[PDB]
Write an enzyme that holds these catalytic residues in place. Structure first.
Site, PDB file in Angstrom:
ATOM      1  CE  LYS A 181      -3.633  -0.918  -0.243  1.00  0.00           C
ATOM      2  NZ  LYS A 181      -4.308  -1.341  -1.498  1.00  0.00           N
TER       3      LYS A 181
HETATM    4  C1  LIG Z   1      -7.132  -1.992   2.797  1.00  0.00           C
HETATM    5  C2  LIG Z   1      -5.870  -1.806   3.119  1.00  0.00           C
HETATM    6  N1  LIG Z   1      -4.882  -2.819   2.794  1.00  0.00           N
HETATM    7  C3  LIG Z   1      -5.128  -3.754   1.711  1.00  0.00           C
HETATM    8  C4  LIG Z   1      -4.345  -5.043   1.961  1.00  0.00           C
HETATM    9  C5  LIG Z   1      -4.437  -6.075   1.086  1.00  0.00           C
HETATM   10  C6  LIG Z   1      -5.324  -5.950  -0.150  1.00  0.00           C
HETATM   11  O1  LIG Z   1      -4.737  -5.066  -1.059  1.00  0.00           O
HETATM   12  P1  LIG Z   1      -5.723  -4.105  -1.964  1.00  0.00           P
HETATM   13  O2  LIG Z   1      -4.884  -3.194  -2.829  1.00  0.00           O
HETATM   14  O3  LIG Z   1      -6.590  -3.272  -1.050  1.00  0.00           O
HETATM   15  O4  LIG Z   1      -6.599  -4.967  -2.841  1.00  0.00           O
HETATM   16  C7  LIG Z   1      -3.726  -7.242   1.314  1.00  0.00           C
HETATM   17  N2  LIG Z   1      -2.940  -7.352   2.409  1.00  0.00           N
HETATM   18  C8  LIG Z   1      -2.846  -6.324   3.282  1.00  0.00           C
HETATM   19  C9  LIG Z   1      -1.958  -6.451   4.518  1.00  0.00           C
HETATM   20  C10 LIG Z   1      -3.556  -5.156   3.057  1.00  0.00           C
HETATM   21  O5  LIG Z   1      -3.459  -4.091   3.961  1.00  0.00           O
HETATM   22  C11 LIG Z   1      -5.445  -0.525   3.835  1.00  0.00           C
HETATM   23  O6  LIG Z   1      -4.237  -0.347   4.143  1.00  0.00           O
HETATM   24  O7  LIG Z   1      -6.301   0.354   4.116  1.00  0.00           O
END
Ligand SMILES: C=C(NCc1c(COP(=O)(O)O)cnc(C)c1O)C(=O)O
Ligand SMILES: C=C(NCc1c(COP(=O)(O)O)cnc(C)c1O)C(=O)O
Lengths: 471, 470
Positions: free
Chosen positions: B51
């Site tokens: 992220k």
């Molecule tokens: C939604 C959020 N994270 C997505 C996330 C995901 C999913 O990634 P996305 O780009 O949201 O699809 C997978 N693993 C972890 C540890 C994550 O934090 C956030 O940081 O607000």
């Protein structure tokens, strides 16, 4: 471009090193530094420490000389990071790991080496190096009593300084384009300082090399610098020992800077806050030593500082304000704790509850009413929120918004008990509590509620913000 | 070679991305996988999560359109990692940060965003997205009530999927040389899956793209997959929501795999143990989904899995065996806990003390060191236990006496408390040997007690030598 990682890597060991050098312009501007404070982010290695390198390094040597076969046991006295690197190497190449580490070291290092399937034997903090109860002596005993065991002994193995001389210092040289004027580096085993200082002085003799030693160790030159706190236990992990290791060549270093626990930790948090490098406490020690050493340097000149460790190993230790307040360490120049102390001060929730206006008329319920019974109360009593409570003593909060939306969402049946849809995370407070403590509690709990069992109301972050708007 | 980091970087933001792809041959051999299970180590970014990218990305967009000026406040609802990335960007470029995150998320994320000078407002776990007490609604309220504030809204901002389409998927493509047969990737906001799947299917249409959704969410297709545990709270953080985000294009994904908490955490620890990637729990979920999805693949075929998060954010949560035992999650196939359970079993320190001798002497913890050396020389014992009146002080060895007296730390008239070992763990004979091993993970000595009659001390060498006798 993409040169080192442009393909697929066979193992995690191939992701060790190749860390990026970042200019700490924010931190220098905060501390009033003329020169460019370059930081070699060794904590961005796969294992989150510079020692990953030597770990891999030593194994490679032990394998290039045939001294190591599959299934063997590796024993290593470490402050935690060399243990982590060697544990990575063993989990990859199929060796058994036994780590011997002092009790002063963090629990995160132990947990990570446990996840890596390593046996962990701890030694007392106050033990001297001569002791059989030292980590080195215990490692020696484990060698003597166990078969197919090996001690790579990072304090005397030539790989430890030789690889810092071969790759790390060459990395720094290629990244600084040869123009390095000062190198500030902590002294633990002394391998990193030895290797880096030699390679840099060989390819740039004009560079001064400054060693960082904690107040408590005897690695500084002369002993007029070690006698502030002789053999005094300190909290910074990784640097300083009660003896000069075999790989440490104290003749290759020019200056010595003594750094205590307080400066090290406050500067580590300043590094995190001002630059955004999730880095360890030893790195704060190194950066404070650098801020002291490169003070006389001018602009254009570059002072390279190693950030050996990641915050990962001290995540409960000094990133938590709780622990540094208990150990009496200045939080930071600009921190959230000090901001709350300035904004809120000694204002208590009595003051907020009186200034806002409330008569503790917060309707309670026995936490097992049917949702229809409670909606009659919500719609007829003109309240929006309610507090659910049991007999054996608080359950949580409930809003009519969640009622409607969960009933539409298929989670709140009309005959369901009210406990199923209430908010179960709460923080208990009482009117004499300050707003700094409720501000700290709002960091972990959505609501903060006060409390014959007569609770007076609920307080959230918007309430504190709106109070601050009144001030 | 050295292309991206061969110089000096202006800020931490320039160290985002450029993560390495590692072949999890050990983990595949453990789970019996023929194909090459490639792992994109997104946790090796500067902020330790994928992220970071979108965080940086959105700021750049907000600055390339002039929508953002210095001193402004940035508000963002997140599970924690986008908050961390945006807090990094704000601490670098001088913006104020307010993060709105559910209380279910770990305390490490909160502490780290606090170190980055970010205000943290928590929201209830059980809240739906429509609620004013949801993280998104609270962020909207903070926008409405605060001036110079902005919500970049990673759930609907085009930067989130567009940058995964621009750089991350192109990184995967350049690293796999176009040969990508399956892509397994968790579904949170859905930006990473959308962007990566699109770019990979554009440059390799033959690739199957598999989405990972936790048991509890509604992101899988069809709803015959979400109805095992509908809207059930889960411990895995980052993936799964109670609504389809605006950036998630569920048509770009081919398969969907349901992964629960237990499988996710046990496989994350398996990743750490077998590969050595200090990775998050969502990564365990993704890797378990990949192990299920790419099962029918053959050798040569490459299945790319994202490891979004680092162990850093879950350091107290699931790296600690305590918490996964308390939450009833299978520790691992091969773990230290299970190794102690097999080696020790139900043996108690009664058994070791009887197989091996009684009541090593004591001292009142304020004897002069000369008095205690006289006691040791007359009693022929090597160790002694120091104890106060108000109730244990520690252990002492004659080796430390001699070496500290020679070292300038032990005065001849000094009290014995100054040289004793102050870290101890108290036990009692009914305790098992696996528990004393767990205590030995954190304390050098483990000493026993009932009157204050201390039956003796036990260290790791004692347990090893007992295991040598068995
Ligand atoms: C939604 C959020 N994270 C997505 C996330 C995901 C999913 O990634 P996305 O780009 O949201 O699809 C997978 N693993 C972890 C540890 C994550 O934090 C956030 O940081 O607000
Ligand atoms: C002594 C060990 N580490 C050295 C170290 C150092 C000193 O690096 P040296 O290579 O020992 O000179 C600085 N910071 C941290 C966090 C360290 O762990 C060890 O892992 O056993």
């Amino acid at each position: 471009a993409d040169g080192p990682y442009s393909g697929i890597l066979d193992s995690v060991l191939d992701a060790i090193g190749n860390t990026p050098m970042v200019r700490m312009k924010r931190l220098a501007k905060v501390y009033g530094l003329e020169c460019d404070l370059l930081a070699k982010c060794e904590f961005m290695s796969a294992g989150g420490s510079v020692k990953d390198r030597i770990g891999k390094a030593m194994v490679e040597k032990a394998e290039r000389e045939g001294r190591l076969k599959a299934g063997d046991t590796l024993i290593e006295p470490t402050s935690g990071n060399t243990g982590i690197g060697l544990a990575l190497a063993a989990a990859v190449r199929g060796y058994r790991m036994i780590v011997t580490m002092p009790a002063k070291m963090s629990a995160e290092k132990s947990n990570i080496m446990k996840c890596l399937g390593a046996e962990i034997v701890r030694t007392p903090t106050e033990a001297a190096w001569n002791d059989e109860n030292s980590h080195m002596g215990v490692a020696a005993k484990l060698q003597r009593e166990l078969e197919n065991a090996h001690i790579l002994d990072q304090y005397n193995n030539t790989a430890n300084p030789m690889v810092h001389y071969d790759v790390t210092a060459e990395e720094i040289i290629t990244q600084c384009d040869g123009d390095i004027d000062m190198v500030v580096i902590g002294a633990g085993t002394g391998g990193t300082i030895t290797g880096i200082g030699r390679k840099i002085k060989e390819r740039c003799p004009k560079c001064k090399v400054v060693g960082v030693d904690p107040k408590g160790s005897i690695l500084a030159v002369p002993d007029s610098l070690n006698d502030e706190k002789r053999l005094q236990s300190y909290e910074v992990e990784g640097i300083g020992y009660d003896f000069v290791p075999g790989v440490l060549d104290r003749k290759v270093v020019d200056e010595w800077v003594k750094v205590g626990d307080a400066e090290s930790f406050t500067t580590a948090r300043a590094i995190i806050r001002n630059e955004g490098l999730f880095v360890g406490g030893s790195s704060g020690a190194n950066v404070w030593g650098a801020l002291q050493a490169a003070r006389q340097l001018k602009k254009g000149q570059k002072c390279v500082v190693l950030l050996p460790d990641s915050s990962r190993n001290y995540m409960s230790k000094f990133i938590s304000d709780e622990w540094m307040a208990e150990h009496g360490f200045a939080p930071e120049d600009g921190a959230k704790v000090k901001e709350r102390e300035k904004q809120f001060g000694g204002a208590r929730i009595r003051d907020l509850l009186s200034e806002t206006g409330a008569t503790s008329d917060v309707p309670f319920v026995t936490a097992r009413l049917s949702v229809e019974d409670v909606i009659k109360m919500m719609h007829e009593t003109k309240v929006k929120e309610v507090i659910v409570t049991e007999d054996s003593k608080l359950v949580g909060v409930l809003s009519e918004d969640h009622i409607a939306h969960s009933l539409q969402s298929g989670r709140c049946a009309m005959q369901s008990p009210v406990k199923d849809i209430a908010f179960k995370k709460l923080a208990k407070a009482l009117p004499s509590a300050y707003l700094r403590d409720v501000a700290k509690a709002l960091d972990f709990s959505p609501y903060v509620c006060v409390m014959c069992p007569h609770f007076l109301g609920v307080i959230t972050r918007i309430d504190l913000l709106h109070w601050l708007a009144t001030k």
